[PDB]
Amino acid sequence: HAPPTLWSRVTKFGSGWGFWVSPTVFITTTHVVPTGVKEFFGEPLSSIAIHQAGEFTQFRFSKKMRPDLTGMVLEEGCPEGTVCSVLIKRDSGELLPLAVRMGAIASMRIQGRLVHGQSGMLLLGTIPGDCGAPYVHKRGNDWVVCGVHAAATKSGNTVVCAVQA
Ligand SMILES: *[C@@H](O)[C@H](C[C@@H]1CCNC1=O)NC(=O)[C@H](CC1CCCCC1)NS(=O)(=O)CCCOc1ccc(OC)cc1
Numbered sequence: 001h002a003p004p005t006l007w008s009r010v011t012k013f014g015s016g017w018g019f020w021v022s023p024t025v026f027i028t029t030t031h032v033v034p035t036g037v038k039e040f041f042g043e044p045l046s047s048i049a050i051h052q053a054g055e056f057t058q059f060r061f062s063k064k065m066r067p068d069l070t071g072m073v074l075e076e077g078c079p080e081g082t083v084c085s086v087l088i089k090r091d092s093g094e095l096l097p098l099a100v101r102m103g104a105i106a107s108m109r110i111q112g113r114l115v116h117g118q119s120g121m122l123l124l125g126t127i128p129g130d131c132g133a134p135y136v137h138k139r140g141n142d143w144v145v146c147g148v149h150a151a152a153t154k155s156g157n158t159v160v161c162a163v164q165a
Helices: none
Strands: 010-013 016-020 025-029 049-053 056-060 083-089 095-110 113-122 134-139 142-152 158-162
Touching: 010 025, 010 083, 016 142, 025 142, 083 142, 095 142, 095 158, 113 142
Parallel strands: none
Antiparallel strands: 010 016, 016 025, 025 056, 049 056, 083 095, 083 134, 095 113, 113 158, 134 142, 142 158
C-alpha cells in the first residue's frame, strides 16, 4: 500500500517520469530527459548538480523544490528475491502499482545502450512512456527506492530498472 505522498513523488518529466527522493533530489531514466531543454522545473541547468550513468540520472537542485517531502533512502538496486512495486502513473492519471520479484543486478545492452540494470519478473504490463517510474519497497516502517523503469522484454513478463552506480 503506497500512500498518497509516495505517489505524489512520481512526476511527469520529458517523455516519461521521474521521482522526488527528497526535497532536492530527483531521479529518472536518462533517455527520457529532454535534450534541447535548458530549464528543469523553472531552474536553469547551471543550478542543478547532475549525475548520470548506465541510464540512471540524478538531479540535485540548489533550492527545496518539494519541501513537503521527507528524504527517503535511495539504494543501488535491492537484494534478489525482493518484491518491489513499480509506481506507474499513466498520462490519464491512472495509478498502476505493479508487483515485481527482483532478480540479479547486471550490465545490459538494451537497444544499443549500456544499462546498469536489475531484471525483475512481474507477479497488467508496462508501455512506452512509463520509463522513469520508480521501483520501491518497504524497509519495515519506511519506503526504499532502488531503481527507475527502463525496459521490458519483447515478451512482457520481465522488466528492467536502471539502478545507481
Ligand atoms: C520507456 O521508455 C520504455 C518502456 C518499455 C516500452 C515498451 N514496454 C516498456 O516497459 N522503454 C523502452 O522503450 C526501451 C528504451 C531503451 C532506450 C535506451 C536505454 C535503455 C532503454 N527499449 S525496449 O523496448 O524496452 C527494449 C526491449 C528489449 O528489452 C531488453 C531487456 C533486457 C535485456 O538484457 C539482456 C535486453 C533487452
